[PDB]
């Protein structure tokens, strides 16, 4: 049981004192994908029922806001999305 903030790429920054949290409330990084669902880390400020947009032009609705992630439902297939992609709010 691990949180998206606890993955071993961010803790190399936190341990190193990096304070690059200037990444706005608009942009987030995909963490998991499957079956028409996506799970993001970030977007602290996104509304429930709000539209978000992926790298490859597709769009989705943010439904399950959570303390550590954000749950998104996709308007299309999952072949376009892959882990590590960027998502921005409309």
């Amino acid at each position: 049981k691990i949180s998206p903030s606890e993955m071993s790429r961010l803790l190399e920054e936190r341990i190193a004192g990096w304070k690059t949290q200037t990444s706005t409330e608009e942009v987030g990084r995909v963490v998991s994908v499957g079956d028409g669902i996506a799970r993001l880390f970030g977007l602290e400020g996104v509304q429930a029922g709000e539209l978000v947009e992926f790298q490859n032009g597709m769009t989705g609705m943010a439904l399950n806001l959570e303390t550590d992630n954000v749950g998104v439902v996709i308007f299309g297939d999952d072949r376009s999305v892959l882990e590590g992609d960027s998502v921005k709010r409309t």
């Binding site: 049981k1 691990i2 949180s3 903030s5 606890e6 071993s8 803790l11 190399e12 936190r14 341990i15 190193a16 004192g17």
Partner: protein, 180 residues
Amino acid sequence: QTLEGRYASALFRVAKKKNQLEKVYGDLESVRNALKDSSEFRLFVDSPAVSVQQKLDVLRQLVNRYKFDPLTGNLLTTLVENKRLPMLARVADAFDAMYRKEKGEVKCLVTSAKPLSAQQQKEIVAALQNRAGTQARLIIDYAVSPQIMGGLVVRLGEQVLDFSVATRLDRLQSQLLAPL
């Protein structure tokens, strides 16, 4: 792998990269010894009545009042931000058990009663030529089930060399009860 494994790997990596190893190395031993000797720092870590702000304040006071690097402070701030402060001791154990590893290992070891400086020297030199790790700071212990023959664990997990009397005896017996 585990949570403490993740944090220990991150700390090992970053301290191998940017600051140093020896500072954090001494820091982990001092922190573990403070946890195991004070008997109130442990409850301070485990108790939930302590607010996150009081926790961070006491941690920064320990930083200032002791020889302390920023990497360990960021580690503690992260564990507090993620509610993983009770995992301090565990993290320390993992950081000492892969690992704490470039300079010198710490190993557990057991006897019956007090051995002598002579066979102590022999034990350490034999374990040193076996390890080929130039630094070894060990432990002594007393459990009398393995009768007197020296059992130990050089701390890397997959090497528990069970040089004992009763263990070899029972293994042999259970082997030679085989059919024909």
